Ligand binder design. Structure first.
Ligand SMILES: *[C@@H]1O[C@H](CO)[C@@H](O[C@@H]2O[C@H](CO)[C@@H](O)[C@H](O)[C@H]2NC(C)=O)[C@H](O)[C@H]1NC(C)=O
Ligand SMILES: *[C@@H]1O[C@H](CO)[C@@H](O)[C@H](O)[C@H]1NC(C)=O
Ligand SMILES: *[C@@H]1O[C@H](CO)[C@@H](O)[C@H](O)[C@H]1NC(C)=O
Ligand SMILES: *[C@@H]1O[C@H](CO)[C@@H](O)[C@H](O)[C@H]1NC(C)=O
Ligand SMILES: *[C@@H]1O[C@H](CO)[C@@H](O)[C@H](O)[C@H]1NC(C)=O
Ligand SMILES: [Ca+2]
Ligand SMILES: [Ca+2]
Ligand SMILES: [Ca+2]
Ligand SMILES: [Ca+2]
Ligand SMILES: [Ca+2]
Ligand SMILES: [Ca+2]
Ligand SMILES: [Ca+2]
Ligand SMILES: [Ca+2]
Ligand SMILES: [Ca+2]
Ligand SMILES: [Ca+2]
Ligand SMILES: [Ca+2]
Ligand SMILES: [Ca+2]
Ligand SMILES: [Ca+2]
Ligand SMILES: [Ca+2]
Ligand SMILES: [Ca+2]
Ligand SMILES: [Ca+2]
Ligand SMILES: [Ca+2]
Ligand SMILES: [Ca+2]
Lengths: 421, 425
């Protein structure tokens, strides 16, 4: 033939002047020994400063320290003066010179709790500088909790370097296990495997899991009437095991479904139920309430509890009474000395009642003895005439009825009238 | 001195209804005490009769005390009338239709306090708070009714317990109706509607329209042009549906618009720097706990002829200004080498032509395209004279994309170099 081809190889970062080969082996067998090897290489894509070639002998040696990280293979054609050509190719072999390394020695990851199984979280891989089998390779997770909750599945990323993806497995709830301290290890090819390690602080975020639960389902009280407005009634308790604003319990009181919540109000951040106006049993017998609590934050969860406040009465309402006169026109009058054993009015007693229903004793003032008092059924009273009402230098008599309440404290009620002839 | 009677009468009866007969005394006329528009007494030893229809619910109090009258001593016997109900009112809720919100994907036990109906009638004829039923809307079987009654006689509460499995993406709303019945001789009914509007939670992540995106870009693309367009979607509603795109590795000379998803050229490109980019695109939703979807994006650069070719020579001496050849050089020996270097790829550079200019395109010595594609040989195809032509000024040409069809966009770009030859024996 009239041409030849030859391939060569050399290791990395070996000193300059190291032997590469001889162009003589690439020439066709039997051809004349040339006096000079004309070198033709791709300009700028080439030998330049990175090879030394002897033109008169054909030996090749390394011009400097050789790094295949920048340039892996060289190619150039040697031409003899006779016309024969030898296509030469020099390859730089790789040796583990750059060990793997992580950009973060102690990285931190944030993953929401209760996350779906199998969702993947990529991480920063240990970049391979020495390409080929010597970099790259595979990650191994050495952290605790990696057998049950956190596994590692490798995925090749850009340019083929492997990117670690921490997959989700098992249980994840910060209410029990707050955070994990994992450790990552990276190896590489070559009989002496270079290694790199880094720690990973995986923390679990919080979400609105638990609604505010109360101490007891329903509360109770037995406050009396006319209680001090500034006085307390009872304190409610509610808990929420979440963190941040999701653990803040703001106690409130439902205004719709609660019947009798008018006189009441609850402290916002202590659950202390306190009244604002005094209540009356002779108006409202019992108060039925529903309290709530908000799981503070975005879209709050809602808890609820019941409040039952019974009321027992006290004798504070004055006795009432009505009077109607039974003589002709309702207006008070009497005849000129009316017959005896005659009645001129009617009285009925009433009161807001607890204990003794009604049963009030009246105290009609005198009437100078010409009038008397009688009762029908201990509730309705009458007014009788005595002494014939002789009109002895007397025209009309100012009379008054006193309603005396039969309670523990004395409670009086006045009611005056004028009876004429 | 102790006569007192009590009468009982029904409500919603036509006027003139006989209530009762007050006991009479011979020779006496009885009339009313105070004028009120409900009753009037027959004085001829008669009885007591109503004078108008009355609704018991319209009265301030049921029992009403009345006082009689008499002829001469005006002896008064008291009379009390009790009016009852007959259940002429039906149970009614404070509002016919309300709206309650439930948390989707929540476990069983989530409930909400609802309104309790009330009836204007008496106790026995009042609402039966244990007879609440949900008659329509719950055909799917999601909710149930739990009623909590109170130890106090005045009070009742109703709950709407959800048995879990609520999903907005499956069914975001339920319209329910409740049937309550008056606990009366006539069982009369009441109704309340519930607009159940569940709330959206971020349970679904963004998903791209395709798993692998491919696009070709010319390396002459100006800064700001479009590369490709990604598209994603989220099954949730509102804030949990707003997707923000981003390139997972924005160290590339590209840039991702976080809203439209249009990869743009952020820095000027070059084909000889890198062939193609194997990127990865993200899709992040604005939910309260954010989620992310991914897909690979491949961008291939397209080469254009933006680098010109050069020719460098290697002749008989090395460290020499000008080439030197012996005169007795036998015909057929190589003098120099025509090394044609081109950085651009052949896909955008076409066939390379080389011709002779300003020298000896005259068989003085031939040029030959060697077996190597780019390399050419400079030989001596004839024996010459030294005194006649002692030197040469041979230059050559080299063109990119030469021999192209007419109207081709791949215009040619050339560069010429020269090498001299001297005869020195
Ligand atoms: C002859 O060789 C010279 C190099 O020594 C080439 O370069 C040109 O030299 C002439 C000398 O008079 C200058 O006028 C030009 O400006 C140089 N450049 C160019 C691009 O022409 C020269 O080209 C050679 N002669 C020819 C005809 O090409
Ligand atoms: C909480 O976590 C511990 C591990 O620290 C585990 O042993 C325990 O079972 C967990 N709680 C429950 C209820 O499973
Ligand atoms: C919870 O409620 C009970 C009921 O009276 C009470 O005794 C107890 O103190 C409450 N818990 C706290 C922490 O106050
Ligand atoms: C009272 O009833 C009797 C019943 O026979 C009737 O005759 C009389 O007319 C009635 N009184 C009046 C004022 O009509
Ligand atoms: C409940 O839905 C009905 C459907 O027509 C609507 O008319 C009603 O206004 C809704 N309730 C409220 C409070 O808007
Ligand atoms: Ca190296
Ligand atoms: Ca290496
Ligand atoms: Ca390595
Ligand atoms: Ca939580
Ligand atoms: Ca919470
Ligand atoms: Ca209220
Ligand atoms: Ca009172
Ligand atoms: Ca009282
Ligand atoms: Ca009293
Ligand atoms: Ca009625
Ligand atoms: Ca009624
Ligand atoms: Ca009723
Ligand atoms: Ca859902
Ligand atoms: Ca949803
Ligand atoms: Ca979403
Ligand atoms: Ca370019
Ligand atoms: Ca180019
Ligand atoms: Ca070119």
């Amino acid at each position: 033939p009239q041409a030849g081809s030859l391939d060569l190889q050399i290791d990395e970062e070996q000193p300059a002047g190291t032997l590469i080969g001889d162009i003589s082996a690439g020439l066709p067998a039997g051809t004349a020994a040339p006096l000079m090897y004309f070198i033709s290489a791709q300009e700028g894509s080439g030998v330049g400063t990175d090879l030394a070639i002897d033109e008169h002998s054909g030996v090749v040696r390394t011009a400097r320290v050789l790094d295949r990280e920048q340039r892996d293979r060289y190619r150039f054609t040697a031409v003899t003066p006779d016309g024969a050509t030898v296509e030469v190719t020099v390859r730089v072999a790789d040796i583990n010179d750059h060990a793997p390394a992580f950009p973060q020695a102690r990285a931190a990851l944030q993953v929401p709790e209760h996350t779906a199984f199998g969702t993947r979280y990529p991480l920063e891989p240990a970049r391979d500088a020495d390409a080929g089998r010597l970099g790259t390779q595979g990650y191994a997770l050495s952290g605790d909790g990696a057998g049950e909750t956190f596994r590692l599945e490798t995925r090749p990323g850009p340019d083929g370097t492997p990117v670690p993806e921490l997959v989700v497995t098992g249980e994840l709830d910060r209410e029990n296990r707050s955070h994990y301290m994992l450790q990552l290890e990276a190896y590489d090819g070559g009989s002496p495997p270079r290694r790199a390690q880094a720690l990973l602080d995986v923390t679990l975020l919080d979400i609105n899991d638990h609604a505010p639960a109360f101490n007891q389902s329903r509360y109770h009280a037995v406050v009396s009437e006319s209680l001090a407005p500034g006085s307390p009634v009872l304190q409610v308790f509610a808990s929420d095991a979440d963190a941040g604003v999701n653990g803040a319990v703001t106690y409130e009181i439902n205004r719709r479904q609660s019947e009798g919540d008018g006189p009441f109000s609850i402290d916002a951040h202590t659950g202390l139920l306190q009244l604002e106006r005094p209540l009356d049993f002779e108006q409202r017998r019992v108060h039925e309430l529903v309290v709530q609590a908000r799981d503070g934050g975005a879209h709050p969860e809602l808890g609820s509890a019941f409040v039952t406040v019974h009321v027992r009465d006290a004798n504070d309402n004055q006795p009432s009474m009505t009077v109607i006169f039974l003589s002709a026109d309702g207006s008070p009058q009497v005849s000129e000395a009316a017959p005896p054993g005659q009645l001129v009015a009617r009285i009925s007693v009433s009161d807001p009642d607890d204990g003794d229903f009604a049963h009030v004793n009246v105290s009609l003032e005198g009437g100078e003895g010409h009038f008397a008092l009688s009762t029908q059924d201990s509730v309705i009273y009458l007014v009788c005439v005595a002494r014939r009402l002789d009109r002895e230098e007397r025209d009309a008599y100012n009379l008054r009825v006193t309603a005396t309440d039969s309670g523990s404290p004395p409670l009086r009620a006045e009611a005056a009238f004028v009876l004429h002839v | 001195a102790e006569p007192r009677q009590v009468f009982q009468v029904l409500e919603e009866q036509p006027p003139g209804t006989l209530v009762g007969t007050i006991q009479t005394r011979p020779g006496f006329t009885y009339r009313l005490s105070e004028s009120h528009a409900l009753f009037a007494i027959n004085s001829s030893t008669g009885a007591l009769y109503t004078t108008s229809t009355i609704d018991r619910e319209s009265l301030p109090s049921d029992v009403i005390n009345l006082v009689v009258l008499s002829s001469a001593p005006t002896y008064p016997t008291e009379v009390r009338v009790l009016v009852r109900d007959l259940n002429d009112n039906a149970p009614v809720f404070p509002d016919p239709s309300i709206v309650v919100t439930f948390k989707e994907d929540s476990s069983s036990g989530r409930q909400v306090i609802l309104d309790t109906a009330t009836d204007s009638d008496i106790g026995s004829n009042g609402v039966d708070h244990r007879s609440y039923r949900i008659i329509r809307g719950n055909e799917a079987g999601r909710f149930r009714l739990d009623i909590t009654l109170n130890p106090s006689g005045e009070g009742a509460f109703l709950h709407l317990v959800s048995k879990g499995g609520l999903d907005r993406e499956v069914t975001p709303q339920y319209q329910l109706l409740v049937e309550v019945e008056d606990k009366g001789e006539p069982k009369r009914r009441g109704y309340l509607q519930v607009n159940v509007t569940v709330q959206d939670i971020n349970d679904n992540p963004p998903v791209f329209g395709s798993s692998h995106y491919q696009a070709g870009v010319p390396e002459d693309a100006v800064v700001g042009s479009s590369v490709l367009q990604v598209a994603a979607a989220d099954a949730d509603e509102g804030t949990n549906a707003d997707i923000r795109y981003r390139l997972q590795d924005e160290g590339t000379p590209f840039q991702m618009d976080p809203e439209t998803g249009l990869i743009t050229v952020r820095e000027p490109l070059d084909f000889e720097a890198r062939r193609q980019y194997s990127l990865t695109v993200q899709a992040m939703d604005r939910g309260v706990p954010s989620l992310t979807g991914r897909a690979e994006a491949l961008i291939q650069l397209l080469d254009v002829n933006d680098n010109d070719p050069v020719v460098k020579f290697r002749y008989f001496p090395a460290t020499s200004r000008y080439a030197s050849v012996d005169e007795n050089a036998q015909v057929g020996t190589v003098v120099a080498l025509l090394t044609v270097t081109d950085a651009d790829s052949p896909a955008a550079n076409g066939n390379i032509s080389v011709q002779i200019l300003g020298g000896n395109e005259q068989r003085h010595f031939e040029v030959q395209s060697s077996k190597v594609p780019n390399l050419s040989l400079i030989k001596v195809a004839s024996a010459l004279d030294r005194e006649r032509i002692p030197s040469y000024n041979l230059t050559v040409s080299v063109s990119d994309n030469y021999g192209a069809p007419p109207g081709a966009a791949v215009q040619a770009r050339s560069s010429v170099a020269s090498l001299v030859i001297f005869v020195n024996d």
